[PDB]
């Protein structure tokens, strides 16, 4: 089964460098041209680079020409993207796509037929900050509780409820940037019987600051 897995992403300073890899599996890698496509809210999908199976040919999108360098390790089934002189404009999710050829009787047609999950690359000078998790306690057969995780950088932050036991009726909202600091909120709904007789806790992990905190929602009073 065709399988592409990207990695290398992270937070990089404007003007810095980073190399993303893309591990393939399930097909004879050395026979397929590979691509790097990226996506940002303000971009949608945007092609980055192209490299033939043997690398005798390579293409760069203008915005990337002169700064990035796509390359490949056919024996290690790895494709790479060396980025340098990064700009905020380069912040995006990088996917590596496989240029597969459909054996058309009209002549083989090439189409990026398989993509990966992608890696996040944020280029910013904003400083890494662990978030503050705050308990959202109630003021019906169901009661909504929640957690506010504010003041963190960079994304992402992981939010779980009762170690994952509580999975149904959970809304974890998209984080918003307000002065280089993110803020996100999650909500969990439980039968009113369960609260407070049974504990509800949001488990929040922020990998970048290596911070992990669990916050028990206790009645206000």
């Amino acid at each position: 089964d065709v399988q592409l897995v990207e990695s290398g992403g992270g937070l990089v300073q404007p003007g810095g460098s980073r190399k993303l890899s893309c591990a393939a599996s399930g097909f004879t890698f050395m026979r397929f041209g590979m691509h790097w496509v990226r996506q940002a809210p303000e971009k949608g999908l945007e092609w980055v680079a192209y490299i033939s199976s043997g690398s005798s040919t390579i293409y760069y999108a203008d915005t990337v020409k002169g700064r990035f360098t796509i390359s490949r390790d056919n024996p290690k089934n790895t494709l790479f993207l060396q980025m340098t002189s990064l700009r905020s404009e380069d912040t995006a999710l990088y996917y590596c796509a496989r240029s597969g050829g459909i054996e058309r009787y009209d002549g083989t047609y090439y189409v990026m037929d398989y993509w990966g999950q992608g890696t996040s690359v944020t280029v910013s000078s904003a400083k890494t900050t662990p978030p503050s998790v705050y308990p959202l306690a109630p003021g019906n057969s169901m009661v909504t509780l929640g957690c506010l995780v504010k003041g963190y950088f960079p994304e992402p932050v992981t939010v779980t409820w009762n170690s994952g036991s509580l999975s149904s009726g959970v809304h974890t909202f998209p984080a918003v940037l307000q002065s280089d600091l993110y803020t996100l909120s999650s909500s969990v709904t439980v039968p009113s019987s369960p609260r407070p007789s049974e504990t509800v806790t949001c488990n929040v992990a922020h990998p970048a600051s290596s911070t992990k905190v669990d916050k028990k929602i206790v009645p206000r009073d």
């Binding site: 992608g118 705050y134 003021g139 929640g146």
Partner: protein, 215 residues
């Protein structure tokens, strides 16, 4: 560069109906009698998936409910009937010239029955207050359509300043939308006011759902 322009930007089709997404190029896309127009599908938190290639050819494992058509400059993606799993961003892409260009994407959604929102309001936590801040959180959950007007009243006055609203992508099992509105003040200013109100006007009613609390 060949600019691909899709239309509409956003849809909303009921289960069982047919959805049609249009994508036009600035320059012809078929070289000979083969149209180099591709269509992809991208569900939230998901890589894109190949749907159609060469204008009308089905990608691997793509149901006969998706079809593609058009030639030269104008192309279309059809989906019939609409099913509960189809909600996604559809993009067209030309692969005749370099660079490879994509369209802006069209967000097709399931048009479900209207649904009023479930509003809940939460005052600042002791812990945050203790740290000098006062964030008031308001959850407007499970509504449809996403079109909603969220406002704040502090002691009766309209407060445009200091709030961040955040929507969730159409729910996968519900087809509803959700949103958190957060008003952020300082502990000091928070303590200068009595009433804090979170209000929502939505087509499911003429009067807004007003949720409030007196500190």
């Amino acid at each position: 560069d060949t600019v691909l322009t899709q239309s509409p930007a956003s849809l909303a089709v009921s289960l069982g109906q047919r959805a049609t997404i249009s994508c036009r190029a600035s320059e012809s896309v078929d070289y000979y009698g083969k149209s180099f127009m591709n269509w992809f599908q991208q569900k939230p938190g998901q890589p894109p998936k190949l749907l159609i290639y060469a204008a009308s050819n089905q990608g691997s494992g793509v149901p006969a409910r998706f079809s593609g058509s058009g030639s030269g400059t104008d192309f279309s993606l059809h989906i019939h009937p609409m099913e509960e799993d189809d909600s996604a961003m559809y993009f067209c892409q030309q692969s005749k010239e370099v660079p490879w260009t994509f369209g802006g994407g069209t967000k097709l959604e399931i048009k479900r029955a209207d649904a009023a929102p479930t509003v809940s309001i939460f005052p600042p936590s002791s812990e945050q207050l203790t740290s000098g801040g006062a964030s008031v959180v308001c959850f407007l959950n499970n509504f449809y359509p996403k079109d909603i007007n969220v406002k704040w009243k502090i002691d009766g006055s309209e407060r445009q300043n200091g709030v961040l609203n955040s929507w969730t992508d159409q729910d996968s099992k519900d087809s509803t939308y959700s949103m958190s509105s957060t008003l952020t003040l300082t502990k000091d200013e928070y303590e200068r006011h009595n009433s804090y109100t979170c209000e929502a006007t939505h087509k499911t009613s003429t009067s807004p759902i007003v949720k409030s609390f007196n500190r």
